[PDB]
Design an enzyme around this catalytic site. Structure first.
Site, PDB file in Angstrom:
ATOM      1  N   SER A 243      71.325  45.279  76.371  1.00  0.00           N
ATOM      2  CA  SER A 243      70.785  44.105  77.045  1.00  0.00           C
ATOM      3  C   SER A 243      71.227  44.102  78.499  1.00  0.00           C
ATOM      4  O   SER A 243      70.396  43.947  79.377  1.00  0.00           O
ATOM      5  CB  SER A 243      71.264  42.814  76.372  1.00  0.00           C
ATOM      6  OG  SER A 243      70.392  42.471  75.318  1.00  0.00           O
ATOM      7  N   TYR A 246      69.225  45.250  81.439  1.00  0.00           N
ATOM      8  CA  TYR A 246      68.052  44.507  81.908  1.00  0.00           C
ATOM      9  C   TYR A 246      68.380  43.459  82.937  1.00  0.00           C
ATOM     10  O   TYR A 246      67.497  42.734  83.401  1.00  0.00           O
ATOM     11  CB  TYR A 246      67.291  43.879  80.739  1.00  0.00           C
ATOM     12  CG  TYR A 246      66.657  44.915  79.848  1.00  0.00           C
ATOM     13  CD1 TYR A 246      65.407  45.447  80.152  1.00  0.00           C
ATOM     14  CD2 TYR A 246      67.361  45.456  78.767  1.00  0.00           C
ATOM     15  CE1 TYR A 246      64.868  46.513  79.403  1.00  0.00           C
ATOM     16  CE2 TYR A 246      66.839  46.524  78.015  1.00  0.00           C
ATOM     17  CZ  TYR A 246      65.589  47.049  78.338  1.00  0.00           C
ATOM     18  OH  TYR A 246      65.062  48.102  77.606  1.00  0.00           O
ATOM     19  N   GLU A 327      67.033  47.006  67.868  1.00  0.00           N
ATOM     20  CA  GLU A 327      66.204  46.155  68.672  1.00  0.00           C
ATOM     21  C   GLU A 327      65.659  45.124  67.687  1.00  0.00           C
ATOM     22  O   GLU A 327      65.231  45.496  66.594  1.00  0.00           O
ATOM     23  CB  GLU A 327      65.078  47.015  69.243  1.00  0.00           C
ATOM     24  CG  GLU A 327      64.348  46.426  70.422  1.00  0.00           C
ATOM     25  CD  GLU A 327      63.988  47.474  71.458  1.00  0.00           C
ATOM     26  OE1 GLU A 327      64.784  48.424  71.606  1.00  0.00           O
ATOM     27  OE2 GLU A 327      62.928  47.339  72.133  1.00  0.00           O
TER      28      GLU A 327
END
Length: 351
Positions: A243, A246, A327
């Site tokens: 994560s 991002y 995911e």
């Protein structure tokens, strides 16, 4: 003056920084001179998506080259790009098209932030910061660095930093308890589902005003389903680093924000490969792209009834999988309840 705690004041200033919004647009190669921050229209973005939707269809089905050229012209005419002395690339490559769909997901949040920033700012008795905080419709509180909550979350961060992501370290600077107006009520029917976990969600700092006021969202109907690995849903990870990537930080700009949301997973539709899920197989509540590494199931603890996979990254045993890491995708905005917002400092290994 401001009646909020300092870290909350610093947080608000950060998410409403106008210069970061421009920098984001420049990175996306938008022509700030022909398309200023104040030109962003929600309608404009929808049309842009339809164009990407149609052009993607043409590249997939072997449509006329004329068609792809016309669509490209319409797109660039709608969203002015600045390519320097370079010739503008046509939307004839499926990967460049995906990139453009990502840019619009981001433009939607930046538009929200700017709107709010120039919205209701008329009062002398309220510090500008307090006014903007209120526009967020989210109650934010600082979590004490010594409570159990803080300790667990810090463990979750340290233990799940993936192997291939050793281009940097992570230091938790601050942890905030967040509660968006009406979100707990919306999420209520999902408390019934089993397999509710505390998962990660990273984004650019320039997206946070949209995230906090609108909540996490799914791409609009106009967006091509193909523009996403597992379809149009909300994505999460159990590895903090997956994560964290991002947040789009850098040595020049190391501070990132990351979310911890409780997500009602239920029976997961497990996949090993990308699939453009349009609808879920009756009986399933979410999708789970299987990875080679994942937190150690033996260490999995609980916090307020929600599973926290804070275990050390271990190999999972699955060999035939496209993904390195897990995911998780939900297809209903109501299946998520944001809990914490973390201010992270990326310590990038040097020269």
């Amino acid at each position: 003056k401001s009646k909020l705690a300092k870290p909350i004041q610093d947080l608000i200033k950060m998410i409403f920084d106008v210069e970061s919004m421009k920098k984001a647009m420049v990175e996306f190669e938008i022509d700030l001179q022909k398309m200023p921050l104040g030109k962003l229209s929600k309608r404009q973005i929808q049309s842009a998506y339809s164009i990407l939707n149609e052009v993607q269809q043409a590249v997939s089905d072997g449509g006329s080259e004329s068609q792809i050229l016309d669509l490209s012209n319409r797109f660039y005419t709608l969203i002015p790009h600045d390519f320097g002395m370079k010739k503008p690339p046509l939307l004839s490559n499926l990967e460049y098209i995906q990139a453009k769909v990502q840019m619009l997901d981001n433009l939607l949040d930046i538009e929200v932030a700017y709107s709010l920033l120039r919205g209701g700012n008329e009062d002398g008795d309220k510090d500008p910061i307090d006014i903007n905080y209120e526009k967020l419709r989210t109650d934010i509180k600082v979590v004490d660095k010594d409570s159990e909550e803080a300790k667990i979350i810090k463990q979750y961060v340290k233990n799940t930093h993936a192997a291939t992501h050793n281009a940097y370290d992570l230091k938790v600077v601050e942890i905030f308890r967040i509660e968006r107006e009406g979100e707990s009520q919306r999420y209520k029917p999902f408390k019934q589902l089993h397999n509710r976990q505390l998962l990660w969600h990273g984004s650019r700092t320039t997206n946070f005003a949209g995230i906090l006021s609108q909540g996490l969202r799914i791409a609009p109907p106009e967006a091509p389903v193909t523009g996403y690995m597992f379809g149009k849903g909300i994505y999460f990870a159990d590895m903090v680093s997956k994560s964290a990537n991002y947040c789009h930080t850098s040595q020049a700009d190391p501070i990132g924000l990351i979310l911890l949301g409780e997500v009602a997973l239920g029976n997961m539709y497990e996949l090993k490969n990308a699939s453009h899920i349009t609808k879920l197989p009756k009986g399933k509540h979410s999708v789970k792209g299987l990875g080679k590494t994942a937190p150690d199931p033996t260490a999995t603890t609980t916090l307020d009834g929600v599973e926290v996979p804070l275990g050390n990254g271990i190999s999972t045993g699955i060999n035939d999988t496209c993904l390195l890491y897990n995911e998780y995708i939900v297809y209903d905005v109501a299946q998520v309840n944001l809990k914490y917002l973390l201010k992270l400092k990326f310590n990038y290994k040097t020269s």
